[PDB]
């Protein structure tokens, strides 16, 4: 029930993804899998009257960074978070940041690849899953660091002594419910997922609303023998799948 | 046979938008017949638009703009906020027949009437800027949104429309704190080239300002507004 | 039962895959998420000010009772604000702010019970009011009904000797007869310029300013709910019930606490042990 | 009737209250966009002479 070799990663196993002057390799590859069934159309918002500024090929593509590195330091549950689209707003953020600061609303999904190698002597999986509205920072920023920080019931009022809990609850014994894959260090070297455009109102006004955090938790700490690799770092590759943007203005130096 | 009724507990109520009849007292009373009568409407939306009179310069509001013979691109002539609720169509029918309602959608058109001299020309930048890195500063900032450019000549006014751009299908129709739902850009207004004039006529020039609703313009969800006085 | 659960999915067994079994399948219809939601749950205890019926109207809470209510499932209040508006909070606050203190009975607002099983993070409905008095003796109450996002600060009196909450075209609900049923019903549209609603939070402030405080979106409640009546000593329940509800995207529920006890459960609700 | 798939109600008689009065009226919107039906009512001001053709002819300067 998996498909066909090993030491060295096989055959249906080897799968590449070509977005435009980008392309993704993988040589352990698991399934990608496509969020709630279902991707973007990249249909226009009925919301606006405005012809919106869509297909372009610059935009339509991976952009690569690194996350952090996995050490046998991190017990289970600690995460990063990578909010999205916000991410991709500056200079890492190519055409697509670019054509985004200049625009009031957009309309995208996203196609995400994370990776992450090691060796057959070593043992650790990862948990990576992406969420429609999961509480990120304030100012939507990647996690500068592992945390488990709020996480079951929520960050309360200092003040609020016997609160039950508060809205950004996160009982991350049930993390699976979210479109998710584990990335088992004995199974593979990388992490494929696409989910479609999922929001309160037809096209987002990204700018002060993130609607979709991808996180990346431990599940299975990090075990080796002396002599192998001793940190793990995780890079993901990230693509806008068919953004449809509307609401063209200026940009400055406005908020971001 | 009486017919046995279950009682519920919502009994002896009175609901204030009940659809519903009640008891008639006086029936079979025929009317006096008024066929004669012409002029009724049975929508409202069917008035709105019919463009009225934009407050400038508010509060001593006059309906109009004035333009002058120096096109300076840092200063606006007009800017107004895309808000039924602005001050500036505080008066308007589309702002006085909108406040009776919750949400609205669709187009909204500013109609500007050129009222200077024959031997004078113009031309103004009007724009729509929508919401996210604040207000132009320049009519440069500006004319990266949605513009048009009204040459002055043999056709008095120009009519702009601001295109309904939004997250939400519907937007809330009166501003109060402003919010992600609430509001929705500036529409401003600038000479591209200044007002210019022979010898014998007057320098400078007002440009009525009226509002309507467009064909696309809906409203829903009646209410009733916070009560005013007018003194 | 060999799998390869690094998928995202694995796949459906009953006892007939790995064992000589057989299936066990009898139908149920009552874990549809309509019918579950289709039951009327409390939000709190609500009360009324004196000759409200005949005065202008000024937020207030008898003890942390008060005046109006935004329907909404989640929570709203603060307790340090009895005497002012109740706005929406992200949190839960409960009966003492103090070590020593304790959590239930809760002082904020919300539906605990929606709070505790809402496994999903938008949902859409329209909502059933019931307001239950506790006299069963004579009660009278007015109530406002104001849609989201709109005026609601029914403050100034227009007409002498009548409630500044019984003015206008916007919906108004009074009882109050010898011969009544001292309770009130009635079912409000969905009113909010949003598609759908945030069950749990929203990653996003309230304006283009950016200006922190996420987790509430503007106007995502089915409206605010002004209150006036004859009886002010007299508390009365307010229930929500969800009709014809939709949820979209499954997330996770609610913590429960670990046995420190022992090895399953039971009754001895939040606390330490039993 | 129906998220989903169907609530608390199991009344054999027919509601009082019509849908559209007791329900909220589920719409859908096209991404493409919705054409105003070109009139709302039968209010209308007149303009008549807006144009030309038919008085004392031509003298018409021209």
């Given at each position: 029930?998996?498909?066909?070799?090993?030491?060295?990663?096989?055959?249906?196993?080897?799968?590449?993804?070509?977005?435009?002057?980008?392309?993704?390799?993988?040589?352990?590859?698991?399934?990608?899998?496509?969020?709630?069934?279902?991707?973007?159309?990249?249909?226009?918002?009925?919301?606006?009257?405005?012809?919106?500024?869509?297909?372009?090929?610059?935009?339509?593509?991976?952009?690569?960074?690194?996350?952090?590195?996995?050490?046998?330091?991190?017990?289970?549950?600690?995460?990063?978070?990578?909010?999205?689209?916000?991410?991709?707003?500056?200079?890492?953020?190519?055409?697509?940041?670019?054509?985004?600061?200049?625009?009031?609303?957009?309309?995208?999904?996203?196609?995400?690849?994370?990776?992450?190698?090691?060796?057959?002597?070593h043992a650790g999986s990862l948990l990576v899953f992406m969420a429609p509205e999961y509480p990120t920072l304030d100012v939507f920023a990647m996690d500068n660091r592992w945390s488990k920080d709020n996480l079951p019931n929520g960050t309360r009022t200092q003040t609020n002594r016997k609160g039950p809990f508060a809205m950004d609850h996160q009982n991350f014994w049930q993390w699976t419910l979210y479109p998710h894959q584990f990335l088992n260090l004995r199974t593979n070297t990388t992490v494929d997922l696409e989910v479609p455009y999922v929001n309160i109102a037809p096209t987002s006004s990204w700018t002060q609303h993130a609607s979709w955090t991808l996180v990346i938790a431990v599940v299975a700490p990090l075990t080796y023998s002396t002599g192998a690799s001793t940190s793990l770092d995780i890079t993901a590759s990230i693509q806008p799948v068919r953004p449809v943007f509307n609401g063209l203005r200026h940009e400055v130096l406005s908020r971001q | 046979s009486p017919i046995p009724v279950t009682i519920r507990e919502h009994a002896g109520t009175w609901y204030s938008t009940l659809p519903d009849s009640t008891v008639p007292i006086y029936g079979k009373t025929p009317v006096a017949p008024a066929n004669y009568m012409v002029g009724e409407y049975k929508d409202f939306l069917e008035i709105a638009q019919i463009p009225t009179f934009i407050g400038n310069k508010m509060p001593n509001a006059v309906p109009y703009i004035e333009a002058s013979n120096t096109a300076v691109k840092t200063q606006p002539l007009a800017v107004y906020q895309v808000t039924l609720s602005c001050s500036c169509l505080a008066n308007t029918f589309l702002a006085a027949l909108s406040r009776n309602f919750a949400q609205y959608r669709g187009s909204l058109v500013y109609t500007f009437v050129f009222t200077g001299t024959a031997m004078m020309k113009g031309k103004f930048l009007i724009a729509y800027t929508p919401p996210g890195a604040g207000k132009p500063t320049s009519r440069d900032q500006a004319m990266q949104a949605t513009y048009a450019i009204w040459d002055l000549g043999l056709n008095s006014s120009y009519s702009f429309t601001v295109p309904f751009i939004s997250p939400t299908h519907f937007r809330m129709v009166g501003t109060d704190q402003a919010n992600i739902t609430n509001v929705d850009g500036w529409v401003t207004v600038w000479q591209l080239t200044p007002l210019t004039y022979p010898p014998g006529c007057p320098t400078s020039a007002k440009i009525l300002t009226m509002v309507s609703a467009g064909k696309d313009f809906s409203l829903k969800m009646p209410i009733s507004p916070a009560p005013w006085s007018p003194q | 039962g060999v799998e390869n659960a690094e998928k995202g999915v694995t796949e459906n067994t009953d006892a007939t895959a790995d064992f000589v079994a057989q299936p066990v399948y009898l139908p149920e219809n009552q874990t549809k998420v309509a019918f579950f939601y289709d039951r009327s749950s409390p939000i709190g205890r609500f009360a009324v000010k004196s000759g409200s019926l005949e005065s202008g109207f000024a937020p207030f809470s008898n003890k942390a009772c008060p005046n109006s209510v935004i329907l909404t499932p989640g929570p709203q209040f603060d307790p340090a604000y009895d005497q002012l508006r109740p706005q929406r909070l992200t949190e839960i606050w409960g009966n003492g702010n103090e070590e020593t203190s304790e959590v239930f009975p809760l002082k904020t607002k919300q539906d605990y019970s929606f709070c505790l099983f809402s496994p999903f993070v938008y949902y859409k409905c329209d909502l059933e009011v019931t307001l239950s008095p506790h006299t069963s003796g004579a009660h009278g109450l007015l109530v406002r009904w104001c849609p989201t996002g709109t005026p609601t600060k029914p403050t100034t009196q227009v007409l002498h000797e009548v409630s500044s909450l019984s003015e206008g075209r916007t919906p108004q609900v009074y009882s109050a007869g010898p011969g009544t049923s001292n309770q009130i019903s009635f079912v409000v549209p969905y009113n909010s310029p949003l598609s759908v609603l945030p069950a749990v939070w929203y990653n996003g402030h309230k304006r283009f300013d950016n200006t922190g405080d996420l987790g509430i979106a503007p106007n995502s409640d089915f409206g605010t709910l002004f209150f006036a009546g004859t009886k002010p000593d007299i508390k009365f329940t307010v229930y929500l019930r969800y009709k014809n509800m939709r949820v979209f995207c499954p997330r996770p529920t609610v913590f429960f606490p670990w046995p420190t006890s022992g090895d399953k459960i039971d009754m001895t609700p939040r606390a330490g042990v039993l | 009737n129906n998220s989903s798939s169907e609530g608390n109600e199991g009344v054999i008689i027919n509601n009082f209250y019509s849908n559209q009065y007791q329900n909220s009226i589920d719409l859908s919107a096209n991404a493409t966009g919705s054409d105003p039906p070109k009139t709302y009512g039968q209010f209308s001001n007149l303009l008549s002479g807006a144009v030309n053709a038919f008085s004392n002819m031509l003298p018409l300067l021209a």
């Open positions: 029930d998996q498909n066909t070799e090993e030491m060295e990663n096989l055959s249906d196993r080897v799968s590449q993804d070509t977005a435009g002057n980008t392309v993704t390799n993988t040589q352990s590859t698991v399934g990608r899998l496509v969020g709630y069934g279902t991707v973007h159309d990249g249909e226009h918002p009925a919301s606006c009257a405005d012809t919106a500024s869509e297909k372009i090929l610059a935009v339509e593509r991976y952009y690569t960074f690194k996350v952090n590195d996995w050490t046998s330091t991190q017990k289970p549950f600690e995460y990063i978070r990578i909010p999205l689209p916000h991410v991709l707003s500056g200079e890492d953020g190519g055409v697509f940041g670019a054509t985004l600061r200049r625009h009031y609303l957009v309309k995208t999904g996203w196609r995400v690849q994370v990776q992450c190698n090691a060796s057959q002597f | - | - | -």
